[PDB]
Each structure stands twice: as structure tokens, then as C-alpha cells.
């Protein structure tokens, strides 16, 4: 543990009781550098400054794989999990390693060209899997250089095989790449220093590129970020006076949200209560998180009247009308236009590390208020939450007696629609509201 003991006030309402913080029971010997979670939110990984790795089953509260610094390659350029949280891919400067985390073992090791000092982003995408017998994946490796490699990875009970199947080269360096595993296609989207976003999409056996268009009213703005909601087949392109929300299936600008200038690479999106009804991807709310390029403050913009009330149609399979007479679970609800969305803004003080839940409905944060020597030291932290839909803030004071934490909090990542992980030096805290993750 991170202290001799922690002290909190006893809860006086059921609402307070549901607001929870707990330490993850495992930790690293040096500060945590990087954290990640699988797409299905089952599996969490943390990587220390010393390359140590811990992979953790969130719902079962147990360790799946722990590797110390001396059990790891001496270089580690990237980590990634498959979308189901059963495999991890680790990349050193010259080697990739594929581990089974469900039944721990090394399935495969493969040597690979990297152009160091090349920065890597790695993504798993489903290929032609099915079922419990064998699985196929595409493993995509993106280099800041503009190089994109795609590997076909087959996994079996026994072991695995891999092959470099495609290689692409972009005309500019890559600021940011993302994967979109959509219902229509596997897609890789890259924002380059040119300001272009190039999307490579797979149809059948063949990848093809397209260059996306931002809102033509705003062509001189610097492009700052891209972010995808893969199941809606939507890409968000952030620039300096807003964000363009683009349908990648039918190639179509759906809306431009108005925002202040956004700091490069700091933008994310969550949407709530996602359901698909008669060709419509519907959500109850949309939330954006970004760092304001002027004030360097972290901001949360929340749009919507919330669930019990209305919904927003984010995208449609077919951008045509359709009088299908089928079951519509949202009958008693109002469909809203983009222009009649209500916008609520929450700005966070620099002192806090904050992060929103995966559906954008809750913001959580932590700040160290104070510390004092015992002759070790005692620290007072504030743990807080904000419910974006009820407009309700809650905070708990957390006193740590003989704390072993000397770092400022961060980095941080959503772990479910009601729970977040916040790094505290070499520990991680889970903070949530009414979350089944506890405990």
C-alpha cells in the first residue's frame, strides 16, 4: 500500500457511499509512465519508467502477468492490447512479442524494422477470426515518419504466425494516428503535419486511401487532433474554432461544433447510451475533453438533455429516409437536432489531474492539497467527481499517513462508463461512481 493508513470521513448518504476510491493492489518499483486498457474494458496494463509491466484483470481484481525490469527487453517503444483483452503486444526497438495474458505465455517473437528515433503507435484490428479455435488479427504499426506497416497475425492454441502483408508511406510526418474498427470496415486514420487526414480503409482484401475534407469555411485553420467512435463509423477532426464530425461510411460532414482553440493532441470524445435503432446510431449525450490552447486549462464540454428525455442521432447507415415499422425503444423520447443541443462547460484547475469516464457522463479528479513531515510524510488529497448530466459535484478529503507517493497525479484513463484509473507515482487509484468494479 501507498501509506501506513488512509483517513476519510464516514459517508452520510447513499450518494456519497457510491463515490469510491481504491488503490490497485499491485505496484511498480519506479513511477508509472504509461497505462492502457482493452477495448472491452476487461484488461488493464501499466508500464513503469523501468519497462516493468503489470497486466491486471479489472473485474476479477487480479494480476494476469507481471514482468519486472529484469524480465523485459531493455527497450520498449510500444504496447497494445487486443480488443478482447486476452493478448498483449510489446515492441522493443527491434522485436515484437505477443503474449497470452489469459493463460500466460509467449506466443510469438518476431524481429521488425523501426527507424529509431521513430515513435510508434500500435493497434490490433480483428481480421477473419471465429471462434474459440483460432483467431486472425491485423496488427498495425504506425511510425511518426509516415510509415504504416500491417501484419497478419494468426493465433491458435499451440502458438501463432505473423507476416508483413502491407506497407504504406505517407508524404508527411504523422502527428496522430487512430484505428477505427467499424461495422463497415477496418480503417486507419492519420493526421499529418500537412494538415491532411488520410484514412486507409480495408474493403475485402484491399486497402485504399482517401483524404478527408474539413469544413470548407475553415480551410486555413490548423488541424489539431483526430478522434474516432468506431462503432458509429465517425471521425472527429479538431481544428482552431471547432470540431468537424464526419461519417466515414458515406463520406459526409455531419456537423461542426463550435469550440475554442484546442491544443494539439489533447482532444477526446465520449458518448452515452449508444444504441442502434433502424439504421440510426443514437446517443443520449456527447462530451468533449481538451486542453485549451490559449489558457492551457483542461475543459469538458457536455452536450445533451440526457437519457430520460431525448437523444441525438449521431450517424445513419443510409443518409436517406426510412419508414421501417420495427421496434423503437425510444418512442417516448424526443429526437434532437444538432443545433438545439445544450452545451455545459466545466473547466478544471491546473492542480487537478482529471479524466472523464468512457461515456463522457462523469469527470473524476485528484489533487494533493498539502503535505507535512512526521519527524515520511502525511498528505491530504482531494478526490472529486462531477456528474455532467445532473450538474452535481462531490468531493472527498483523503488523508494519507506516511504516504509513499511523491509524484503529482497522472496520467489517467477511463476504465468504464463509471470508473477511471489515475496514476499516483508508482501506484494506481481507481475512482468511480456506482461502479461494479468495486471491490
UniProtKB/Swiss-Prot annotation:
Phenotype seen when the gene is deleted: Cells show absence of mature sre1 as well as inability to grow in the absence of oxygen.
Effect on the protein upon substituting residue 93 to E: In Scp1-M3; strongly reduced interaction with sre1
Annotated region described as Interaction with sre1, given as residue ranges: 74-439
Segments in the Cytoplasmic topological domain: 1-439
WD repeats mapped onto the chain: 27-66, 71-109, 114-161, 170-210
Free-text function comment from the UniProt entry: Escort protein required for sre1 processing at low sterol as well as oxygen levels. May regulate export of the scp1/sre1 complex from the ER at low sterol or oxygen levels. 4-methyl sterols bound to scp1 may mask an ER export signal in scp1 leading to retention of the complex in the ER.
Subunit structure as annotated in this protein's UniProt entry: Forms a tight complex with scp1, composed of 4 copies of scp1 and 4 copies of sre1.
Family statement drawn from the similarity comment of this UniProt entry: Belongs to the WD repeat SCAP family.
Name of the molecule in the record: Sterol regulatory element-binding protein cleavage-activating protein
Gene name per UniProt: scp1
Complete-protein stretch covered: 567 to 1054 of 1086
Amino acid at each position: 500500500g501507498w501509506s501506513d493508513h488512509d483517513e476519510l470521513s464516514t459517508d452520510t448518504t447513499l450518494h456519497e457511499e457510491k463515490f469510491r476510491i481504491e488503490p490497485v493492489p499491485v505496484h511498480h518499483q519506479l513511477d508509472i509512465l504509461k497505462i492502457a486498457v482493452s477495448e472491452n474494458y476487461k484488461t488493464f496494463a501499466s508500464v513503469g519508467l523501468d519497462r516493468s509491466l503489470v497486466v491486471w484483470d479489472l473485474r476479477q481484481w487480479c494480476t494476469k502477468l507481471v514482468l519486472s525490469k529484469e524480465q523485459m527487453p531493455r527497450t520498449l517503444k510500444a504496447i497494445a492490447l487486443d480488443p478482447q483483452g486476452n493478448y498483449v503486444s510489446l515492441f522493443s526497438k527491434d522485436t515484437l512479442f505477443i503474449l497470452n495474458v489469459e493463460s500466460p505465455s509467449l506466443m510469438l517473437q518476431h524481429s521488425y524494422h523501426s527507424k529509431p528515433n521513430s515513435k510508434l503507435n500500435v493497434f490490433w484490428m480483428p481480421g477473419t477470426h471465429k471462434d474459440d479455435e483460432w483467431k486472425n488479427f491485423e496488427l498495425v504499426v504506425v511510425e511518426s515518419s509516415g510509415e504504416i506497416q500491417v501484419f497478419s497475425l494468426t493465433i491458435e492454441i499451440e502458438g501463432a504466425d505473423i507476416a508483413l502483408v502491407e506497407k504504406f508511406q505517407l508524404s508527411s510526418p504523422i502527428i496522430k494516428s487512430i484505428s477505427i474498427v467499424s461495422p463497415t470496415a477496418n480503417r486507419i486514420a492519420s493526421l499529418t503535419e500537412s494538415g491532411e487526414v488520410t484514412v486507409y480503409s480495408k474493403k475485402g482484401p484491399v486497402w485504399s486511401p482517401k483524404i478527408l475534407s474539413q469544413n470548407k469555411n475553415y480551410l486555413t485553420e490548423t488541424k489539431k487532433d483526430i478522434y474516432g467512435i468506431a462503432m458509429a463509423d465517425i471521425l472527429f477532426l479538431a481544428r482552431d474554432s471547432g470540431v468537424d464530425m464526419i461519417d466515414l461510411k458515406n463520406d459526409e460532414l455531419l456537423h461542426s461544433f463550435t469550440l475554442p482553440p484546442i491544443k494539439v493532441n489533447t482532444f477526446s470524445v465520449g458518448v452515452s447510451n449508444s444504441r442502434f435503432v433502424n439504421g440510426q446510431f443514437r446517443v443520449s449525450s456527447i462530451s468533449f475533453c481538451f486542453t485549451h490552447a490559449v489558457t492551457e486549462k483542461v475543459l469538458y464540454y457536455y452536450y445533451g438533455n440526457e437519457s430520460n428525455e431525448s437523444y441525438i442521432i449521431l450517424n445513419k447507415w443510409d443518409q436517406q429516409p426510412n419508414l421501417v415499422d420495427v421496434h423503437d425503444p425510444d418512442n417516448s423520447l424526443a429526437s434532437l437536432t444538432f443545433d438545439e443541443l445544450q452545451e455545459n462547460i466545466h473547466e478544471v484547475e491546473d492542480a487537478s489531474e482529471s479524466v472523464m469516464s468512457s461515456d463522457g457522463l462523469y469527470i473524476f479528479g485528484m489533487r494533493r492539497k498539502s503535505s507535512s513531515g512526521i519527524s515520511g510524510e502525511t498528505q491530504v488529497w482531494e478526490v472529486w467527481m462531477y456528474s455532467q448530466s445532473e450538474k452535481k459535484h462531490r468531493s472527498k478529503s483523503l488523508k494519507m499517513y506516511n504516504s509513499l507517493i511523491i509524484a503529482d497525479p497522472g496520467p489517467s484513463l477511463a476504465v468504464s462508463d463509471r470508473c477511471v484509473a489515475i496514476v499516483l507515482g508508482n501506484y494506481v487509484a481507481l475512482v468511480g461512481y456506482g461502479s461494479e468494479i468495486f471491490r
